[PDB]
Amino acid sequence: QDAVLANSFFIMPATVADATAVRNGFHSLVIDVTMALDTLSLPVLEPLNPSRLQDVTVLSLSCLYAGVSVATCMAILHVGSKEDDYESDAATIVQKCLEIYDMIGQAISSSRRAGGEHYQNFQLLGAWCLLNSLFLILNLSPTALADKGALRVRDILSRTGHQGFGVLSVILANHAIKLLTSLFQDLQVEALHKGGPPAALSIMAQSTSIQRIQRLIDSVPLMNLLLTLLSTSYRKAC
Amino acid sequence: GWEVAVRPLLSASYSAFEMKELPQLVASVIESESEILHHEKQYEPFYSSFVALSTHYITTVCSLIPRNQLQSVAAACKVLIEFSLLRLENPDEACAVSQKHLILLIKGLCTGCSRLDRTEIITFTAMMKSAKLPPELRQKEVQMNFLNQLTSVFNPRTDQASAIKTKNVFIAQNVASLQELGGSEKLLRVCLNLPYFLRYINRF
């Protein structure tokens, strides 16, 4: 919630010590994510009314951020340095994180009290979170971590790739690609035959297609993030 | 030449394009693109029945076409949809294609299926015959399909199902062309501009 104020994305599990502490907090976090997923499988969010709709989006973007932060912490672990048990725990956490995002998305999409622009804006916010997470995990090095011994996409932007990126990073990345594809297909037709300020980080926020995409472009050099991810993935596969 | 073109056309009238003359039909339409667009000439009957059966047989051959000739057919049908939208927006008595048939030829390209019946086809062929503008060749043909493979990098973007895929690609191409032309909106205007619909519309 502090982040929906365009305060950059600011994952916290990042200092060598903070990542140690969160690996400590990994197992108990799985317990909470699992409980939440089991609960929200029932018609808990049936009447998606703006009011409730806000909380429904809140919880979804909440696991999204929790998962991206766990991914960034695993990135610090592999870059800076029962271990297998904790690794499995964090994998399960990120998986259920994406799963809850998808569930709330489909709920807002097929709802009769939510959807359309509301669903589009939920997709926009999810894509924002995922892309910012990808950027943070990509641009962390042993050097930076050791020097630190609360990443800011804007901090890195003003300061200005390989390592940190892993299998959980692949997951968040595929999901971000799905969401970006969706927003860009929207922008096509919108500009039917070729046919404002950046979209606010809020579900009901009203914005044009170009705007949602401008907010997703003002948060990360997008071309850069994407091509960097391509290169890194290709290299790691090789 | 126009004669020889209506010619592979009626040789197909004899039977489903051998797709050996298709590479000729795509050629004709692409170049005669401007002629059909806004001729506004007594040739209306001829050019229009031309456009009609041309759409018909190109729609007949979507399941299987040479990748490159696939691209060719795609371009030809984009042109066809363009002209059909034009006619629908600009209803003309001299046009020998009814808006009902016109919309069906457009849906036909979009659905990778042609609904016209044999009798309609024969009427068209009849009108065509009655209204007819009333080695090096292969070289030029390939040079052209090449200037096309060069400037335009098509993306499939996804042997028994291959034909279906080809049809799917063709269908997507038609839809894309329609959107590029903004024909969907044009069609909307046409629908809302129906003669009998207006009455109930106002009443409602």
Side-chain angles (χ1 to χ4, degrees), chain A residues 3 10 28 32 58 63 67 72 99 122 133 136 144 146 149 181 183:
Chain A
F10 48 98
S28 302
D32 284 2
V58 167
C63 201
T72 310
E99 200 183 306
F122 187 66
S133 169
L136 294 199
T181 280
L183 298 147

Side-chain angles (χ1 to χ4, degrees), chain B residues 27-39 41-151:
Chain B
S28 311
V29 178
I30 299 183
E31 312 129 3
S32 309
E33 160 184 0
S34 63
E35 315 177 1
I36 309 167
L37 295 176
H38 39 273
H39 62 108
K41 234 297 185 303
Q42 55 81 202
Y43 302 84
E44 240 293 359
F46 177 80
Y47 288 9
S48 70
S49 42
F50 169 68
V51 162
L53 295 174
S54 300
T55 297
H56 174 57
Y57 297 118
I58 303 186
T59 299
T60 69
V61 287
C62 75
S63 295
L64 295 176
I65 32 188
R67 266 49 170 85
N68 297 8
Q69 284 295 155
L70 157 153
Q71 188 182 208
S72 306
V73 151
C77 283
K78 162 175 181 177
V79 177
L80 300 166
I81 298 178
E82 180 182 9
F83 187 70
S84 303
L85 300 166
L86 163 64
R87 304 295 73 182
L88 294 163
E89 181 176 356
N90 307 357
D92 157 50
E93 293 177 350
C95 93
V97 175
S98 89
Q99 291 217 359
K100 171 201 56 179
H101 296 125
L102 276 182
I103 284 161
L104 201 32
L105 285 152
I106 300 186
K107 178 184 176 181
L109 291 191
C110 299
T111 58
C113 174
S114 59
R115 295 204 163 186
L116 303 177
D117 312 345
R118 304 164 180 176
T119 64
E120 301 273 11
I121 296 171
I122 301 171
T123 305
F124 284 125
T125 313
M127 297 190 305
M128 168 48 56
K129 170 53 194 175
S130 61
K132 37 173 184 171
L133 313 94
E136 318 79 9
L137 304 314
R138 176 160 185 83
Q139 181 201 11
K140 276 59 175 184
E141 189 283 334
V142 183
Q143 296 221 5
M144 277 34 181
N145 195 357
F146 173 78
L147 313 172
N148 287 9
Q149 291 290 351
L150 261 196
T151 53

Side-chain angles (χ1 to χ4, degrees), chain A residues 64-78:
Chain A
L64 199 61
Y65 178 62
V68 308
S69 305
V70 169
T72 310
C73 168
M74 275 211 88
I76 298 298
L77 203 281
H78 286 58

Side-chain angles (χ1 to χ4, degrees), chain A residues 185-201:
Chain A
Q185 305 305 350
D186 177 6
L187 172 133
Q188 295 190 13
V189 193
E190 163 64 355
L192 191 54
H193 182 62
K194 292 179 179 179
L201 306 182

Side-chain angles (χ1 to χ4, degrees), chain A residues 9-45 47-54:
Chain A
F9 193 53
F10 48 98
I11 296 168
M12 286 299 171
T15 91
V16 179
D18 286 2
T20 306
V22 182
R23 293 178 58 63
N24 172 60
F26 269 176
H27 66 299
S28 302
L29 186 58
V30 197
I31 308 175
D32 284 2
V33 174
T34 308
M35 181 181 340
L37 173 73
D38 300 358
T39 329
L40 290 176
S41 178
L42 305 177
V44 177
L45 36 59
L48 293 181
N49 313 5
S51 177
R52 287 173 74 291
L53 176 67
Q54 217 78 3

